[PDB]
Amino acid sequence: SAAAALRDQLTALLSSMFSQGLVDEQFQQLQMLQDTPGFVSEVVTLFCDDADRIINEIATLLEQPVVNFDKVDAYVHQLKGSSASVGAQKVKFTCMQFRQFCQDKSRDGCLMALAVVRNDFYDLRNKFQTMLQLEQQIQA
Numbered sequence: 001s002a003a004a005a006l007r008d009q010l011t012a013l014l015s016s017m018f019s020q021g022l023v024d025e026q027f028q029q030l031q032m033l034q035d036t037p038g039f040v041s042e043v044v045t046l047f048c049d050d051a052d053r054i055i056n057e058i059a060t061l062l063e064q065p066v067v068n069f070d071k072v073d074a075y076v077h078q079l080k081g082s083s084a085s086v087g088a089q090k091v092k093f094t095c096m097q098f099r100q101f102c103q104d105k106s107r108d109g110c111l112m113a114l115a116v117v118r119n120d121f122y123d124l125r126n127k128f129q130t131m132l133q134l135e136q137q138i139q140a
Contacts, residue, residue: 004140010134019126027087041135044128047086054079055114062110072110079117090120098138132138 017023034040058075058105080095094105101109 004065006134006138008140010131010138013127013131013134017124022090022124023087024089025087026084026089033109038139041132043086046134047082047088048125048128050082051079051091054082055117055121058110058114060137062085062107062114067105067107067110068108069102069105073099088120088124091117091124
């Protein structure tokens with residue numbers, strides 16, 4: 001059936017997200033939490049919005065004549081925590097390393113770290129957006 005084909009598409013996508021290392025056990029636990037029916041889709045939507053917002057706030061801080069490195073570090077820590085909670089482990093590990101550049105008070109190191117944050121966020125956002133579209137069709 002059409003429904004069965006979409007289910008297999010979604011299973012295939014989720015399996016590749018885990019097998020490629022993009023998500024960890026915390027993401028598996030979101031699926032357990034849901035077992036509210038669109039819970040995971042809403043969590044993922046909000047995470048995409050929030051991460052994108054925080055990445056942009058960090059970028060802005062790093063554009064200032066004087067960089068407030070304590071506030072950079074605090075925003076990175078927030079993103080680390082939200083990423084951990086959805087299972088976005090690569091974004092999480094990049095945030096962990098990112099603290100050292102705040103301690104070094106290196107604007108250029110923070111900028112290079114934020115570019116890696118974007119790389120890992122966009123890789124996962126890609127798979128999340130495809131998941132959302134599949135989830136939408138399945139829920140129809």
